[PDB]
Design a protein around this ligand. Sequence first.
Ligand SMILES: Nc1ncc(-c2ccc(CCO)cc2)nc1C(=O)Nc1cnccc1N1CCOCC1
Length: 303
Amino acid sequence: GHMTIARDIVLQESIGKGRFGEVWRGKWRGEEVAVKIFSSREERSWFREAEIYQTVMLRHENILGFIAADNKDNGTWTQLWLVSDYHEHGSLFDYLNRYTVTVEGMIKLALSTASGLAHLHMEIVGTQGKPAIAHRDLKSKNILVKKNGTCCIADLGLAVRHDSATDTIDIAPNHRVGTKRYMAPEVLDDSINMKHFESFKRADIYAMGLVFWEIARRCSIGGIHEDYQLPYYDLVPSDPSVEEMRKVVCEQKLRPNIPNRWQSCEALRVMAKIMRECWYANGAARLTALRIKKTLSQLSQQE
Ligand SMILES: Nc1ncc(-c2ccc(CCO)cc2)nc1C(=O)Nc1cnccc1N1CCOCC1
C-alpha cells in the first residue's frame, strides 16, 4: 500500500475549523499532514470539496496540495476526511497578525496568491484539459503560508467550475455564498449575472485586492508599518451582515483606505495600483489574475 489512506494517519493536534469540518495536524508514515474532518451529515460539503480538489490538472505550487478523500470508522461513527499537505504557519490571516513583512516578503505573498488564483481561473480546453474554477470565498483566512514565505490557496468547497464545450457552470449557484466582508459589490447588491462564469472570476479578483491590502499594511519599511486589520475594520462591525456591507461598498462606494506613505515606495505604489484596479465596482474593468501575476513577476524580477 503506497497511497495515503486515513487508517494510517494519527491525529496529533487541533489546529482550527473551516465553514464545515475541523482541521487537525496528523502524521502519516512519519510525515505531517493536515486533516479536515467532517461528520456523516456534512457529506455534501465533504464530497463537493473532494470533487474540486480532484479536478484534472489542478495541482500547482500555489494551490493547497491535496492527498486524499477517505472515510474513517471509529467503531461508533464514521468521519469523512480530506487530507492535504501541512503548512505550519497556517493562514495568511494568522501569519499577518503575528508578523510584519519585508518588501521582498510582501511581493512573495502577493505574487504567489495571484499565481495560484491565475491557475485556478485558467481553462485548458479538451477532455484531457482543465476547467476554469472560481473560488467564491477567497480571504486571508483561506490562504496558507508555506515555509518558503509563499502562499497556497485552500478551502475550495464553495468553488464553481466552468465547462466551455457547453458554456455551463457545474452547479446551480446560490446567491451570496461566501464571507460577507469580502463579497464583491455585484454580489452584495445581487446585480451579478450568475449565468456568466466570468462574473465569478471577477468577484474573486475584488476579494484578492482586499487580501493585498491586508498584506501591504504589514509591510515594514524603515520600521514603519500599519497594525493588522481586516478590510472594512473602520466601517462595519465584526461579523457584518450583507446589508451593512452593501451600504458601505455599493451605496457609499467606499473601499479600504490607501495610506499616502504607500506612494513613497515603488513596491507599495505597484500594490496600491493593483488594489484600485481590483476594486472597481464594474467587474469587467478589473485586472485579471494573469495580468496581476505578470505585473508582480516584473516587480519581483526588478527587486
Ligand atoms: N493545510 C493546512 N495546513 C495547516 C493549517 C493550519 C496551521 C496552523 C494553524 C494555526 C493554529 O494556531 C491553523 C491551520 N491549515 C491547513 C488548512 O488546510 N486549513 C484550512 C482549510 N480549509 C478551511 C480552513 C482552514 N484553516 C485555515 C487556517 O486557519 C484555520 C482554518
